[PDB]
């Protein structure tokens, strides 16, 4: 999935999110497939708080431009200490995510919806002096988004419905930069074989954006068991717009290069600066989704479900400066499919069970794949229960437990020439949990 994140409560959670939102009275509805909002028939607020434990590791190897391995370079540049390199370490992390859900029924033909959600969120943190450092050292990437839905019930085995989702994305990269093995590679100017680490500065980009977006939902009842639906959120253009900076650790070599213009000549119609304002698109990919959920007896419901993601939007990551290009790096996502299957179980009047699994694609492809975003196809197992209280006006809790179970990738990176020409050969080992809880009121 990229760095596209889930977007539901824990009870979704606890079954791998199989059958979408459309299990009775789920407030998740309200983004996830509004259409089925118009089968709520009551007033809910719900809060969930998830907490991701993400673990990524590389193990392999790095090369230069000459096909050397890879150095720790220098202290401050040439005649200062050699330095040692390392495999990144542990570039994984740790980090909360809320999501809130509220549903207002309106007539008996309209409902609103209201939510705040995350729909985009990723971080890999290498040691900024691993052997991977001309490919990357940050990235950090997460959208949080507001949003307002509205139902209309056509029949009481029909109902569309459409929203918008008003959408913040912040983002960061920094990455190595190895001056003299860039221009060793230019187009003019080349010839003469500089050696590789002794230039050295970290490039740093920081941007923000903040945009519109919208979806639609239908939902279909046949038979008071089955419930279908169909939902699809458009892609979401977002160009995001902030700052790039350089900070040299060099002794001096590439702030000397930039403020001598040695890099235009280097390769001409490049315009780099130890600081400057920058954007770079990164459109949130549109998406679809099929959902049933057959109701087999008065405890047991299981649902199935089946996403396509438009992925393929991703095709490039564009570092542009006062709307010239810096730097263009393709990553040709491909179209992704994630599928789940799961159900929930009541127990009894208070408890209920929940387990589910689902197979999620990765958009990345070995040609294309990098340290940033090192992910693989996952398997996610899952495991929720749920309790409503028995002296309450309507309080219920939910928790949840997954795992991502994402298969070793290999990196077989190549740096085009502006970025060194090195290369990387291994592969990273990740693997994700996350714990859930969410606090649903059902006040009406
Ligand atoms: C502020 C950072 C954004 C927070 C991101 C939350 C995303 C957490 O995980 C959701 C579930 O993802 C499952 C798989 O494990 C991650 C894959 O390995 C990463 C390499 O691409
Ligand atoms: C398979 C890896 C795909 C990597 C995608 C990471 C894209 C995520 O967002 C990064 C934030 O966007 C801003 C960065 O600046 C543009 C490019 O970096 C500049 C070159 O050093
Ligand atoms: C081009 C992005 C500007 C972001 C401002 C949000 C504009 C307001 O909402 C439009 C959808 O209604
Ligand atoms: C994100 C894209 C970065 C593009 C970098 C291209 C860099 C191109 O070459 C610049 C040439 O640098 C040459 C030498 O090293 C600097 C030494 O000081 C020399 C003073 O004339």
């Given at each position: 999935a990229g760095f596209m994140v889930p977007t539901t409560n824990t009870a979704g959670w606890g079954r791998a999110m199989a059958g979408g939102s459309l299990f009775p009275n789920d407030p998740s509805a309200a983004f996830n497939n509004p259409a089925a909002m118009a089968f709520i028939d009551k007033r809910i607020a719900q809060l969930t708080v998830n907490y991701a434990d993400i673990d990524i590791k590389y193990n392999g190897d790095a090369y230069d431009y000459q096909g050397n391995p890879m150095?720790?370079?220098?202290?401050?540049?040439?005649?200062?200490?050699?330095?040692?390199?390392?495999?990144?370490?542990?570039?994984?992390?740790?980090?909360?995510?809320?999501?809130?859900?509220?549903?207002?029924?309106?007539?008996?033909?309209?409902?609103?919806?209201?939510?705040?959600?995350?729909?985009?969120?990723?971080?890999?943190?290498?040691?900024?002096?691993?052997?991977?450092?001309?490919?990357?050292?940050?990235?950090?990437?997460?959208?949080?988004?507001?949003?307002?839905?509205?139902?209309?019930?056509?029949?009481?085995?029909?109902?569309?419905?459409?929203?918008?989702?008003?959408?913040?994305?912040?983002?960061?990269?920094?990455?190595?930069?190895?001056?003299?093995?860039?221009?060793?590679?230019?187009?003019?100017?080349?010839?003469?074989?500089?050696?590789?680490?002794?230039?050295?500065?970290?490039?740093?980009?920081?941007?923000?954006?903040?945009?519109?977006?919208?979806?639609?939902?239908?939902?279909?009842?046949?038979?008071?068991?089955?419930?279908?639906?169909?939902?699809?959120?458009?892609?979401?253009?977002?160009?995001?717009?902030?700052?790039?900076?350089?900070?040299?650790?060099?002794?001096?070599?590439?702030?000397?290069?930039?403020?001598g213009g040695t890099p235009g000549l280097a390769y001409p119609g490049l315009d780099l600066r130890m600081g400057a304002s920058a954007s770079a698109r990164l459109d949130i990919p549109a998406y679809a989704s099929l959902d049933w959920v057959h109701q087999f007896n008065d405890r047991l419901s299981l649902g199935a479900s089946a996403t396509w993601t438009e992925w393929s939007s991703f095709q490039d990551l564009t570092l542009k400066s006062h709307g010239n290009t810096i730097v263009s790096i393709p990553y040709t996502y491909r179209n992704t499919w994630t599928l789940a299957v799961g159900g929930d179980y009541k127990v009894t009047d208070q408890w209920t069970m929940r387990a589910g699994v689902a197979y999620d694609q990765t958009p990345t492809h070995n040609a294309t794949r990098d340290p940033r975003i090192p992910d693989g196809d996952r398997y996610f197992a899952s495991l929720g229960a749920g309790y409503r209280f028995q002296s309450m006006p309507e309080l219920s809790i939910d928790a949840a437990y997954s795992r991502q179970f994402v298969k070793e990738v290999p990196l077989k990176t190549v740096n085009q020439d502006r970025l060194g020409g090195g290369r990387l050969d291994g592969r990273a080992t990740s693997k994700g949990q996350v714990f859930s809880l969410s606090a649903t009121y059902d006040f009406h």
């Open positions: 150095t720790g370079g220098y202290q401050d540049g040439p005649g200062t200490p050699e330095l040692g390199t390392n495999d990144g370490g542990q570039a994984g992390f740790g980090a909360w995510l809320p999501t809130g859900f509220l549903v207002v029924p309106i007539n008996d033909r309209f409902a609103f919806g209201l939510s705040q959600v995350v729909p985009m969120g990723m971080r890999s943190t290498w040691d900024p002096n691993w052997k991977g450092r001309d490919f990357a050292v940050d990235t950090k990437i997460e959208t949080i988004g507001l949003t307002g839905s509205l139902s209309f019930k056509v029949n009481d085995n029909f109902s569309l419905g459409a929203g918008v989702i008003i959408q913040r994305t912040s983002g960061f990269v920094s990455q190595n930069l190895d001056l003299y093995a860039s221009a060793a590679n230019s187009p003019g100017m080349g010839g003469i074989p500089f050696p590789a680490s002794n230039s050295s500065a970290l490039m740093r980009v920081k941007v923000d954006n903040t945009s519109p977006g919208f979806f639609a939902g239908a939902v279909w009842k046949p038979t008071d068991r089955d419930t279908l639906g169909f939902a699809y959120h458009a892609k979401i253009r977002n160009k995001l717009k902030g700052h790039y900076n350089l900070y040299d650790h060099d002794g001096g070599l590439t702030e000397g290069a930039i403020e």
